[PDB]
A paper describes a structure:
Chaperonins are essential protein-folding machines, classified into three structural and phylogenetic groups: Group I (bacterial GroEL), Group II (archaeal thermosome and eukaryotic CCT), and Group III (bacterial thermosome-like). All chaperonin monomers share a common three-domain structure: an apical domain involved in substrate recognition, an equatorial domain containing the ATP-binding site that drives the conformational changes that occur during the chaperonin functional cycle, and an intermediate domain linking the two by relaying signals. Using ancestral sequence reconstruction (ASR) and protein resurrection, we inferred and experimentally characterized the last common ancestors of these groups (ancestral chaperonins ACI, ACII, and ACIII). We selected several AC nodes for protein synthesis and purification, including the last common ancestors of Group I (ACI), Group II (ACII), and Group III (ACIII), along with the ancestor of the Fibrobacteres–Chlorobi–Bacteroidetes (FCB) Group (AFCB).
Finally, our structural characterization of AFCB (Ancestral FCB Chaperonin) revealed a strikingly modern architecture. There was no need for the addition of ATP to generate a stable, homogeneous population of double-ring oligomers. ACIII assembled as eight-subunit double rings without ATP-Mg²+, and AFCB formed 7-subunit double rings. Unsurprisingly, AFCB closely resembles E. coli GroEL, sharing a 71% sequence identity. Although resurrecting the GroES-type cochaperonin was beyond the scope of this study, an analysis of key residues involved in the GroEL-GroES interaction showed that all three essential residues are conserved in AFCB. This strongly suggests that AFCB likely interacts with a GroES-type cochaperonin, hinting at the co-evolution of the chaperonin and its cochaperonin counterpart within the FCB lineage. We selected the FCB group as a more modern ancestor reference because of its well-definition in the phylogenetic tree, and because of its peculiarity of encoding a putative archaeal pathway for ether-bound isoprenoid membrane lipids besides the bacterial fatty acid membrane pathway, that support the hypothesis that LUCA possessed a heterochiral “mixed archaeal/bacterial membrane”, possibly a remnant from before bacteria and archaea diverged. The Group III chaperonin from C. hydrogenoformans, a thermophile, showed the highest rate of ATP hydrolysis, followed by AFCB. AFCB and ACIII showed similar patterns, with a small initial increase in LDH activity before stabilizing at ∼75% activity after 35 min. Tracking these probabilities across nodes revealed dynamic shifts: residues that potentially prevent double-ring formation in ACI gradually gave way to substitutions that favor stable double-ring interfaces.
Residue numbers in the entry:
A (entry chain N), B (entry chain M), C (entry chain C): 2 to 523
D (entry chain B): 450 to 523
Write the structure that this text describes.
Amino acid sequence: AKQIKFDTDARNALLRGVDKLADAVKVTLGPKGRNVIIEKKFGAPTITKDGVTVAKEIELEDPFENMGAQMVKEVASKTSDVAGDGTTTATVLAQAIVREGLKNVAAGANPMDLKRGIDKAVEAVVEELKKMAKPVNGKEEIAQVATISANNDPEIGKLIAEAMEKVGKDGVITVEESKSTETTLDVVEGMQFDRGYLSPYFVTDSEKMEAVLENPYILIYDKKISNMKDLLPILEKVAQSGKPLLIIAEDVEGEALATLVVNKLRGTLKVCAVKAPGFGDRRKAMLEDIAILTGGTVISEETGYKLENATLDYLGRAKRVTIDKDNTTIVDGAGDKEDIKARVNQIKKQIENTTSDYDREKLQERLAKLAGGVAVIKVGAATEVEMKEKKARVEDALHATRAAVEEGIVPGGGVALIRAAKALENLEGENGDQKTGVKIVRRALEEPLRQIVANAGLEGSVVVNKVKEGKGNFGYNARTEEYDLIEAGVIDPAKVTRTALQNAASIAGMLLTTECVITEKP
Amino acid sequence: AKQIKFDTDARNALLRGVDKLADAVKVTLGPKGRNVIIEKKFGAPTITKDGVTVAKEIELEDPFENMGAQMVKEVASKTSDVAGDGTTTATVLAQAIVREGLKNVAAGANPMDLKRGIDKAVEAVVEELKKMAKPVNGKEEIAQVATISANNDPEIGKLIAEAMEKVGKDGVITVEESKSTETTLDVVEGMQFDRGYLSPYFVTDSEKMEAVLENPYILIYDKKISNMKDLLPILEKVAQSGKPLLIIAEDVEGEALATLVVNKLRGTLKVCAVKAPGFGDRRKAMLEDIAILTGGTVISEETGYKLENATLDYLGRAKRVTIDKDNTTIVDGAGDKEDIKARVNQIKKQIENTTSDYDREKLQERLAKLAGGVAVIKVGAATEVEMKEKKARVEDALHATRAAVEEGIVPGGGVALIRAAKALENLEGENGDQKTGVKIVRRALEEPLRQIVANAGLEGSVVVNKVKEGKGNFGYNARTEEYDLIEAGVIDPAKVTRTALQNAASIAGMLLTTECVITEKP
Amino acid sequence: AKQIKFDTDARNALLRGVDKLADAVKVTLGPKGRNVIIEKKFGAPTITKDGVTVAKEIELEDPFENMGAQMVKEVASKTSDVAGDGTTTATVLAQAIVREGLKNVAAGANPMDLKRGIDKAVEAVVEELKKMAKPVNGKEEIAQVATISANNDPEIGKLIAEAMEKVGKDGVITVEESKSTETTLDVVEGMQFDRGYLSPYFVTDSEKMEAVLENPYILIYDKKISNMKDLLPILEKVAQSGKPLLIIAEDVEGEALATLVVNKLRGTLKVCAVKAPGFGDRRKAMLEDIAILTGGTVISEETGYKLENATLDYLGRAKRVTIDKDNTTIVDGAGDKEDIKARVNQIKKQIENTTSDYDREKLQERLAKLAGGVAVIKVGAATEVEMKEKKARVEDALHATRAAVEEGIVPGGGVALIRAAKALENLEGENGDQKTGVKIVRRALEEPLRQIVANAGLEGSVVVNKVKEGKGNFGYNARTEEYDLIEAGVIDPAKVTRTALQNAASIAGMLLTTECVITEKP
Amino acid sequence: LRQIVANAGLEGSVVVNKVKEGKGNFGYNARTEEYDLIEAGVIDPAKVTRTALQNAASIAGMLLTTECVITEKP
């Protein structure tokens, strides 16, 4: 059986679910935010002042409210930032826009024209957000934005600024737990390709949704993997080696996947599988390049090596690898460097050889991918737990600084969306309903400030009004209850605010244009 | 343990079920439709904008309503097109006609006369629709209709136009996931006959309800297969070979099918089985034809070969074999080309020799279905996921172009059904109740147009009146809201509209003349 | 505090009330109808096969149904005939038309078009009945029709035939309760004008709703009477005389009416009041004519006569004055015959003198009513109850024959309405709903005969078809179960059928086009 | 206009759109269902419709701007 709700009843149930998730999450917004307690099975109370954590333990009894909750949760979480105020800002914006849109279109508006107006004004406000952002490019200012990112600790800001200078803007920087007491920085060779694991049952660091293998074995394979019968000796010699093996194959599926899941869950064998990087003839190209990186050899039928022919000598070796959901990192592939610079030489020989722009672009990407290198930081401090907290801080600073160099910075604390609303002053849609949608999103842009100061328990209207009278970077610093942000340095990357607003507009559009809902009866 | 309802109670239960299904499907219609949110048992909620997926997720609690919903879903699913607006329009028309039919028979009308009137007016509307559809005949206009089908992309338009002129009007196209970055076209030998798999548990790609093999083995058999004891070594040598297996036999049933299902579901073996193509002497001849196409040999008691005696040498080989419910395709059978052209020459020799027209026609269709070959559209693009949706787009374009060349094209958006109402102006039945049925099906032809514009949020009355005031292909472009459809390039094949209206009439008549419904006690 | 109900719910309540009334009443229709027991507060319960008595005792609990029943009662009661089969036929036709009309309005029909179609169709049926009616202009066939209306005893038939033959068509006949055993007929001087009593508290014979004054005194007043103080001497001398008084004046209202009502209800003074005949100058002239007719004198200020000084000599003298709701008869005004014939001579002197045709027509009307006289039939028999029963029989015969010569005669038993359905075969309105209304009333014309035969316990479809295949006056006679009505002597006047059908169509028109009913909460 | 044309059982939107397209005294004659009103002779004084519109605006404003209704218990 399946329950079905149509039109206003369905939309109201979805609004109820989204409102419940909002009031669950919106309270933990800002510096002076509230705290939410969690009941966990066979454990103590745990409180959380971060909106990402409180979101994930939301699941409602009523199926309709539940789908609304999971809808806003998923579309809101597509933003890049995970440190904070990325999944909460989007959620409060989504609640605001959805509430006003549904509760106006109940008063006789056209939902589709409302969605059109919402999208138009979101385009206008993201354009203004791009215009407003101050770019960051240079050592002193990336150090400054890192320090603002790292809770005002100059040394981590200096370290990360230096690192992103060494490797390059588009380059890759990774952090890892160290054994020493000092903090230092090296840049090694390595690869990172945007193909993650094949199933989620390899995550070792469940706290961070990543799987890590130490001193692994890398099999460079080109063909498919379907059958259990053919990969026995590799697994046996890996178990006899007592080290992990990471599987890079064309397509692992079926009984092979079932068997490796079984032995991974049982813990007998530390194994992980990822999709093969590249595409086609260039899949073969980057596969043989990463083979010569890691020091192994390719296993492919064009050179007459069956899968079971692979041995210790043919396998590829490195030190550390991380398998996140999207990408995968290879750092310091244990291979002789002379052939690596020979690879780079033949790469530039290809540069001067080729003629077509598509070839030039893709192989310049390859050059940056191999010769660019991997920045590694040996974060270290006095005690273990403080070192864990320090590496967490380094990771958050890395993400924030990467976003800042990507698309500038904006005055944070909810005032960026205030100053971005100036572009909505003299914009009129094709009809009255689109102007209504423009007004709705204009009213919704200021809700982060309203709630960031409502969490502080002050009157919101006075502060938002006298923030609106200002211009430039004038705004409310919620931490100190002052009225400057230019250099006060409570800032957010423009990218996180832009994508939070875009996601909120998207989910509001998909939610205002729904008049049918389908759920199971328990 | 059964509940039986009679007469108006049963018909009202059917009306309630069909109304729920249609309202669930009516929402997603036209280019300005609205969303529907459906959860899966595990994971994210899913948003949809086509009626097909929403149709597949309807199943109600009251058994009578569920029964009516399944009824209309099944008969509405019989339209050949699967892209969209074929099953949605069928459900819309069926709900409209059924509603008005019950809502008129409450006034004392005779349901038999209503059914006869609906059928007669539907036949007249089909005749007018056929007279209205413009023919498509020429590579240029085939390219145009392909481009309109493919969201205004000329490269696919020229691709399918070239393929269609190369293979022929009744020829066969097959789309495959290339490994290369360029989309090329080839003409290769192959086969196709209208019979599929013997069990619904045998689908590999459940996304499109179709099973597929890659580089299989083809055995040719003449008799039945019933038991396990007679087909051990063929399966053993296949499993040692490590390739999939296609099976052609007279009929497979019983323990053989049971063991095949076990070995497939367990994943030990890749196998397939479809029925024999032809009949009598024609079965023997066409079996020999597929055998000499694929390079194998026939197995039969007439020539003294036992199924166990078959070996690798006798087996047939191919590269891509596709099995769906109705048909199946063989491409590039590994055979010697000289023997195939010799077969063609012997076929035409018999064509000159034969005299009877029936055997003549059988020979011409055999010659066409053998010598024509299989076109191979190798769909290549840059990345993987964009290539995959590209493959989906060209599959949809292939189906749409095939329908358009089959039975012409007409204005889309429901305008074709509007313009066909001119034929029913002077069509009167034998009695008054048939005239009421004619009026009933007249009033339903504008319901599709009324709902494409009702999802747009505008009053359907003005647009339908003002398009009735027009003539020819004057129509409502729901995308851009101007009033030209002649060259504007929003259309539908006349075949899909014809089939949708006919299926709607069939279910309308079958529900109108229903007065007893039997279901079980939960 | 008043309840309000709109839309189809109010019409459903009205239909329920009409259904209750019709089911109470329609069982009595026909020659062999059924019985309707009714509750009597004091004494035995009453049984009646006569529908008008059954109709008068209908009043339901839920006010909307009472409201609907009362509307049908009020419309149907306006039929000229009171003997029977006039109100019941109208009720049955209204039931059929209203039920079919609601079922078709719920089918999706415009009530405006349905009402207009019913009006057009009933006009067509009225024209057909006009065409089909056999005229009665002649002494012999009025004798036959009188015999039919009197249950086949020729004596009363020839009596009323001669009474007509003397009195004239527009001339007026009354029934007098005779004292002698023999039945005698007299043509005497009398008067008639259509002005009834001023209040219903004047009725003496409530069985027929008419007030009778035996040998009364009549005064002829020209001015207005309002209050008590002027009329003391007149009622003083009248009470001293011990005979009734007939009040003819311009208008009586207020304290004067209160006084005469008071002394009437107590029985102290037996009196009756009716307005003067004509208008203005015509009132004065015709008041003076009735004054000469009754032997009295006018009481006008023009001749300097007050009312207080009026004496018995100025009063008029007659024998009987039947005061009903609308008419009032004078018989044998005690006036010297020479004077009235001289006044007739003066009327003819005025007829030749005047030139205008309008005044000529009114003077001819004056001559006809004055010189025409009033025929009186003295009905006599042996016993008491037999003589009153014969009085009732002749009263019914008088009404029946009057209507019959008014508009002819047609076949009875609903056959006239059946054969009148031939006209509606080729009548089509401007649009479909009008044709639906035409069909609705065509089915409704079948209902009188269908109920007539259903009360006989037979099957309606067989007889209604077998009557329809016939032509002319071929029809079903339920008294003897034969199939001829030409000379079988079961007919009804065309006037009663026409009036019943028109009244039924009118009530249907008012009821189908109602969308709010406002009632009183108990 | 929607209610006068809906009391006749006709769909209001088409009539109101196609009379709004007209200019001047072009109008819908409900008695005859024709589309001219200049000399056809269905006229209302400007005073009656003016005062009707004034009173409608007044009652609407006075009912919108009302927060509490004070009524006796039966």
